[PDB]
Design a protein around this ligand. Structure first.
Ligand SMILES: Cc1cc2nc3c(=O)[nH]c(=O)nc-3n(C[C@H](O)[C@H](O)[C@H](O)COP(=O)(O)O)c2cc1C
Ligand SMILES: Cc1cc2nc3c(=O)[nH]c(=O)nc-3n(C[C@H](O)[C@H](O)[C@H](O)COP(=O)(O)O)c2cc1C
Ligand SMILES: Cc1cc2nc3c(=O)[nH]c(=O)nc-3n(C[C@H](O)[C@H](O)[C@H](O)COP(=O)(O)O)c2cc1C
Ligand SMILES: Cc1cc2nc3c(=O)[nH]c(=O)nc-3n(C[C@H](O)[C@H](O)[C@H](O)COP(=O)(O)O)c2cc1C
Lengths: 393, 392, 392, 393
């Protein structure tokens, strides 16, 4: 597993971690994390399914979208607060569920992302994983603010009793909503992870029931008063099905590219979906969230302009928590918050409600390309232009 | 040819081959093979025609297709079995014909891919090349299961007697079908191959460059075995095949080893099936595709577009070369699981349910060639940097 | 900040600067500058907002446009002079406002770009920044030719008195126009800049984030100088500008230093001019563009799409920093010749003849984002190799 | 200029030149040439205008075109001969004019490309440059076969007398056609070249008259009986003008990307042009040639399928001539000849006349793209999948 030279090196790098407020963007936590986490943790956290195409595409598709900002608009004041699943929130984003947080943060785990989401002036919703390291009660008890909200992400067990009880329990504990994950009926093949464990129905586990169906969701809807959100939808047809059975929302997601490879970028699915919901006379019947590859405030703004109620982030927070703990999570939150406010100003709007599609240039949303392979001989032999040089010393 | 240093190094690497069950995907057999095979074998197996554009494009075109998976579907059970050329098969894929397998596996050659296809719980169809190292007899005799099926890939000889006899022979031996290759009337230029050995020359009397449709029509009369035209590259020829009544075609370009700039078979498949329907030829033909298939999801996409089966060449060749029969069996297991695992996440439970509504085909045509790089602008530009650790 | 090793190295490189007439293109000044400026100056000048996507896109979008040149046309004589904001100018381009020029040129700052714009045979308009290092007076006083024109770029202060006075002042001083910048109500995040120094903070009372159209309408009444709204990024705002009657706009995003993912001004220009015509606003406004312009052909494309003038920021900044006033003059000569030389090959003889039929705009919209690289497939693949020389 | 270490090194590499028949493709001559030619020659030959975008695009646009080959066709026999400007030729390609051939081949210059074009079984047309190193008569006299044809490329001089006489002269000498170049009224800026000479109307030279117009061509048409071809056309409007004044043809060209940068790939201009010539009832009134970036037989086949009468090549032959002389040129010719025949067989046709557009897939001819710039931080921090490794020795 983790060698002595591995351990020795990382321990030394951890003492050279730069001061938390020298961290400029979310990628910085990722770099530091990639150098300090154990092989196992890094592998667990950073991997995606198979070739990890979807994992990267989730992020790159945001780049097929450009802005059409308004100028000469009074932008002295800006408000990025909004509402999600019935609760008022300070920001348009949230921490999505990430199992085994103790892998990167052994002592605090999820309790630290909870403190991170409520200890600062900006209280951010935290989605709690079913497969979390810590227990539900300790995670919820660690929340430092009564104003902060927490959501419980649920995997339905083959043993429904366990699930029914867990729901009664988290509801008693005070979570504001249930996100039931449906994109993992089977475990995705994360190969970086698999290589380390060298130091078909095997992907199924009764812990997560591969037989979950819409009927099952309809019944769950009857057993609880908590808003229900179907997490992991990847096509418009299922957003419509969700709206028709009456759940509160869906999160357009592919599990951060950790499940089906070649699932589309949720931002693209979002673009296709909202207009169709209007055509089907389902506008606003559902609250639609997206996650995957979101790393910049402008990523969030694009999602909001296309109609997302909220934008989730997984890995960035995981890395912040692992390298700097609760304070890292708070920092991450501050960085994202500011990127959103500053770009909203430049966009020329002053509130989340004003983020609409006419602010986006969607004309090239479909330019997802695959180039003809490189003419290696032609390019190898070719010699490009060179810059002028300084005089010989 | 193969030097002493070459031999010394490779022999040592072969003893460091990792344990067969540490092999995660098809690319792993390729990497190992590339470091252990002889220059000649590697060059022979890994090369494509001219600039090898099509060889790579065959694979890359699969990436112009995305999935539109169904969720909240009972995927506890999944079945990837199907039927090809009248026979029931455990999987939707097969081993395509690859001549000279003894180059990578000197002792067993094709006999080892045969054992690999039937020695495990999953019996996979094996297409036997005309130019195989081993004899038809010994390759078919090597098959360990009576349930496994074998197909014979045929090159029509200028000497038709030789061909007529070979057909009677393989038919007597029990092969379930005849795949007659039509994309190699002349040998493509594999330059990696040629460098090592340092236009009427591309024609050999072995493969008759004069083969025409009439010839196929007559072959149809001389045998009872289903006939499949291997190497179709345009819709017009799929239609001609359906019209002369053969059993199927395999949309292929010889793994990019023949005409460079032939399109990705997956693309030709996407264009073809709808046209077959319009021409009232739906299901008259069984359509297979090969070329650049390396992941289960590649296979699923082909199946959703209507392919009856998906063939793989090189991947199996590499497995056979590095790990022999067990390698082939391993490759088979890897592909089998990739297909089942992703079929579940796709939200379907059988090959029949794999249809085009499961695919996002909106960008199938985004095969691009970028404007050349502005080298001075990019060279001088300095991109953003990541934060750094404190100075030790 | 700037270390001893830094200083020692750069001072030595500055004495090895090549002779000014060995400088072939604008990129050469950029390379030299990047090796000689202080970390602070380089970071300040070369940075863009966040990921710097727009900064680069501003330049790259010019490459989505190709030429459809006329041949067999008498191009013995060529004229690239034109008119901007009521004044005749020798060239179709200008020096856009760049604050803190003393960072790269401590002794002369902006006074040196002024001398550069008028000391040669080609007099180029110079836009003077509000945040310049030098004072308005001294920059205008430094102008060596009475024929050269200067424009004042203005940031409206929260304290309008300061602004009203500054306007009376620059107007008295003789500037030919007022460019009021509207794309920086808040300061963009230049991260290269920030690393060296190791959301209401992005607002300074210097640049009033509350500026609106009404404010511009009133400014129009307090001055006789033509007014140009600098920093327009969408067609709706070009139309609003035309409707309130200002003299023009400059399609710009602050050289990618403000909102990341704002589009390439050239693209916004292509979309805008035809719409202005449809709205019966043809010629009511003079439209300028800036951002990523580095070659004469970039300028020609902007002109063919209807731009009245094309501005350049960084290129001139780099020339001024490395070679001072003479560098600016050199840059001016380089761009001047690139424009004339390519206008001849384009087959036209004057700025007026630069129209869109000279451009191929069919792929203007091919701004793409590729599917991520299949790393295993590409890593394992071995491309063709070139023949080699005999073994020595 | 050329240093002692430069000279010493190159002289040694020239003795290590591999045997001529070990040369597999045109790129091989380019590599060898790039290592053996003098700085000056290489710079002169390999450079294009400004950023050299068009130079590379000329070649890459061929890659936006794919084949739709016919199978089950008797392809035992194949014929790649055709006719150009009234003469029967063994191949569908030719050597385009390249000034100063003595730069790469000091002793023989153009005389060697002439011997190379006629000494073998395949006689290839040779276009002779006005700015050639050798004299017209010696170049024409060096032709070893009476069956081989030569064309004279003309630059019209400000002093028309000189031009009128030169035409009378080359016509007396026996050239079969006049290609008058019109894409160089002014000299393009080849910067690799300029850098070496450190070891506005300055681009004009009365030697090449910048005032040439259509009228001038009409009159030239009256002063000679040789077919005239306007070399350097870059838009459809001028192909139509040429057809209307009655010249024999045009060569869709941009001077190998050595003149206007951002001129289009001639193959693309060809695709657009031929259909328009038919619509305008001008089909076959003109013979249309293309040049630029052609390096493979399939490049040639694509051009022919789109209606080109012949395909020219510049640099490849220049490099072959420079490194191996007359025999190199002959080799180059053999390589191209075979690539064309072998791929024609696989295409499923047996003669040049059968090369038509239904053999091409033109659906993506317009996918000439410019990607959104790279998200450097995201890609830098990302860590891709790795291949399995051999056991530790
Ligand atoms: C290490 C890791 C563990 C995760 N565990 C869960 C989980 O237990 N339940 C769940 O619903 N989603 C899980 N997710 C998915 C996230 O909730 C979310 O979809 C994803 O992280 C968003 O992508 P991003 O990481 O690119 O922002 C996990 C993601 C990661 C990276
Ligand atoms: C080394 C090698 C030898 C081959 N020999 C034959 C052959 O004799 N007959 C035939 O029909 N196809 C032959 N093929 C082509 C395959 O049947 C198949 O079309 C191709 O390998 C599919 O491409 P892939 O390798 O990317 O999967 C050969 C391919 C390779 C790589
Ligand atoms: C270092 C620097 C300082 C600038 N300062 C100003 C300013 O004070 N006012 C303004 O209107 N624009 C300012 N700009 C933007 C320029 O006027 C112009 O829009 C931009 O430089 C054009 O982009 P380019 O550098 O790629 O040519 C500045 C640009 C740079 C690079
Ligand atoms: C070094 C060099 C010199 C050239 N000289 C001439 C010339 O004197 N006259 C002319 O009409 N074309 C000239 N050309 C252009 C060629 O005739 C032809 O257009 C070009 O080489 C085709 O591009 P390619 O080199 O990529 O094949 C020259 C090209 C090169 C590379």
């Amino acid at each position: 597993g983790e060698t002595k030279e591995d351990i020795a090196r990382k321990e030394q790098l951890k003492s050279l971690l730069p001061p938390l407020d020298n961290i400029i963007n979310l990628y910085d936590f990722e770099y530091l994390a990639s150098q300090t986490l154990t092989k196992q943790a890094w592998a667990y956290y950073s991997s995606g399914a198979n070739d990890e195409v979807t994992h990267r595409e989730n992020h790159n598709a945001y780049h097929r979208i450009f802005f059409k900002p308004k100028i000469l608009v009074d932008v002295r004041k800006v408000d990025i607060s909004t509402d999600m699943l019935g609760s008022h929130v300070d920001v348009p984003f949230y921490v999505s569920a990430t199992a085994l947080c103790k892998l990167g943060n052994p002592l605090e785990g999820e309790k630290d992302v909870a403190r991170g989401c409520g200890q600062g002036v900006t209280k951010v919703p935290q989605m709690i994983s079913t497969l979390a390291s810590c227990s539900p009660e300790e995670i919820i008890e660690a929340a430092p603010s009564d104003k902060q909200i927490q959501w419980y992400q649920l995997y339905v067990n083959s043993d429904r009793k366990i699930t029914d009880d867990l729901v009664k329990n988290v509801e008693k504990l005070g979570v504001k909503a249930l996100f039931v994950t449906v994109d993992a009926p089977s475990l995705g093949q994360r190969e970086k992870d698999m290589k380390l464990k060298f130091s078909a129905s095997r992907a199924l586990s009764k812990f997560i029931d591969p037989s979950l169906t819409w009927k099952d969701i309809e019944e769950l809807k009857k057993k609880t008063k908590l808003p229900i959100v179907i997490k992991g939808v990847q096509r418009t047809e299922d957003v419509i099905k969700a709206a028709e059975i009456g759940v509160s929302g869906v999160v357009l997601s592919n599990h951060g590219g950790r499940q089906l490879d070649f699932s589309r970028a949720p931002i693209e699915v979002l673009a296709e979906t909202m207009p169709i919901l209007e055509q089907r006379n389902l506008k606003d019947k559902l609250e639609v969230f997206v996650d995957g590859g979101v790393r910049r405030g402008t990523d969030v703004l694009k999602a909001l302009c296309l109609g997302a109620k909220g934008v989730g982030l997984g890995r960035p927070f995981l890395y912040a928590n692992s390298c700097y703990g609760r304070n890292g999570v708070e920092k991450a939150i501050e960085i994202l918050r500011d990127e959103i406010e500053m770009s909203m100003r430049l966009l020329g709007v002053t509130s989340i409600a004003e983020l609409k599609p006419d602010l986006l240039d969607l004309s090239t949303l479909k330019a997802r390309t695959v180039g003809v392979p490189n003419d290696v001989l032609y390019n190898e032999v070719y010699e490009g232009p060179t810059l002028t040089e300084f005089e010989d010393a």
